[PDB]
Amino acid sequence: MQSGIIHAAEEKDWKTAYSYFYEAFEGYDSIDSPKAITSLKYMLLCKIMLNTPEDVQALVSGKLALRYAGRQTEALKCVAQASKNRSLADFEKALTDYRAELRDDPIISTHLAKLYDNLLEQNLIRVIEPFSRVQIEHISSLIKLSKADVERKLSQMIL
């Protein structure tokens, strides 16, 4: 688990040391359920960043996880719906909402900037996807965060 943490701190997992999150960690028979809360929560918290999150909900559908009808399953189920449904509307349906109280947890708030800007990227993509040359107030006002993020779109599209 600690191998997963420090081999997860900066960049050095998601493809690399995701295996640390469940190798001996699924050797928790059920003695510690609370550590199983902690980086079952982390393994769902990191399969969403590599951005094929079907293993998140598909991991909840496994036999190990309908033994496991817990609170944080609905939390990373909600962030899983945020990754599928590709919207900051499901971040305000997170963070403030249905399972808001996993905002206070140590190695996670550092990732919420990267996850936040990440869902800002693909959410902004989803806003743009049908349009041809619409104006700022549709990209900006069709997510309702600011105008400057659209020109911060200028500082994140480029190429």
């Binding site: 900066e10 960049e11 480029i158 190429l159």
Partner: protein
Amino acid sequence: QAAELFLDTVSTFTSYELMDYKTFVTYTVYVSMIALERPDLREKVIKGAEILEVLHSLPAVRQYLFSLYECRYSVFFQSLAVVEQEMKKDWLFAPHYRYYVREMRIHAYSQLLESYRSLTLGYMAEAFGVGVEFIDQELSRFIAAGRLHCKIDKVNEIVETNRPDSKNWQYQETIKKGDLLLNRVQKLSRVIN
């Protein structure tokens, strides 16, 4: 071939005596932005944790590095004028530094105006503070070379930029290329064989 080879090497050769470091990682981080592509592995330059800590002691090439992607170009031309004073050292020298300042220059302007469908005179003057004629004569020389897509539209003093893609790049490339190749054969395929 130079940057990646350097970039993905780390360098160590019998106590780095031909590497002669205080030179190598610098040579990487001012050989990169010629040919290492500005989106792709430039992040591998920046957020790559192998080089950033050893240019930490080398702040001049550091502020040469994070003055492209951070668009603080009033210090970037300052940073490139430093490189045109430490071009003096290396014996691989003369059309390497003239071509080098040429492609740092052209890659710097093409990075700016590509994001905009229309570039005003005041914002392009905001890139350093050079005003008008530097950008005018210089960019007219670049489009005389035709290596960007901009044009000095002084009708309003607002520069226009669409992008005809690299479908034509090939055609123009290969006229000369083809000619040269056949010419070599044309140099051989006579009686002298």
